[PDB]
Copies of this chain bind each other. A is one copy, B any other.
Amino acid sequence: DIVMTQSPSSLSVSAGERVTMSCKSSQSLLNSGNQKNFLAWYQQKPGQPPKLLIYGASTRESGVPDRFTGSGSGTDFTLTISSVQAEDLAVYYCQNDHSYPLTFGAGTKLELKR
């Protein structure tokens, strides 16, 4: 199986400020064929199911604001939120989304500071 290592495990930030979170895969996710990275990020708000934010390492889903950016390639990926808002409170997971069994990392919990 592909192990996805997420960090940090939790962070606390004030509204309007930038955060970066890392996701490393134990195997390359880059498809040398079509030069695509098979990596998704999901957001899971408290008491809700996960919801797909980004796939292909950096394509945002419809309706996901531009303050989310996914980047990186091969094994080393990043999710940045340039200006965190109150509704961004959630656990963020990265997922190996094409090589079975499909595998999530352990998640980065984002909490807002008052």
- Please name the residue on chain B nearest to A106 by beta carbon: B49
- CA–CA, A101 to B51, complex, Å? 9
Q: Is the Cβ of A52 less than 8 Å from the Cβ of B101? A: yes
Nearest CB on B from A96, distance (A): 10
- Please name the residue on chain B nearest to A48 by beta carbon: B106
Q: Is the Cβ of A93 less than 8 Å from the Cβ of B49? A: yes
Q: Which of A62, A103, A104, A106 has the most CB of B within 10 A?
A: A104
* Complex contacts, A72 vs chain B, CB 8 Å: none
* Complex contacts, A52 vs chain B, CB 8 Å: 100-103
Q: Which of A61, A102, A105 has the most CB of B within 10 A?
A: A102
Q: Which of A49, A52, A102 has the most CB of B within 10 A?
A: A49
Instruction: Map CB proximity to B onto A88-114 as digits: 1 under 8 Å, 0 otherwise.
Output: 000001000000111111110000000
Q: Is the Cβ of B49 less than 8 Å from the Cβ of A101? A: no
- CA–CA, A104 to B101, complex, Å? 17
- Please name the residue on chain B nearest to A55 by beta carbon: B100
A residues with a Cβ closer than 8 A to B are 48-52, 55, 61-62, 93, 100-107
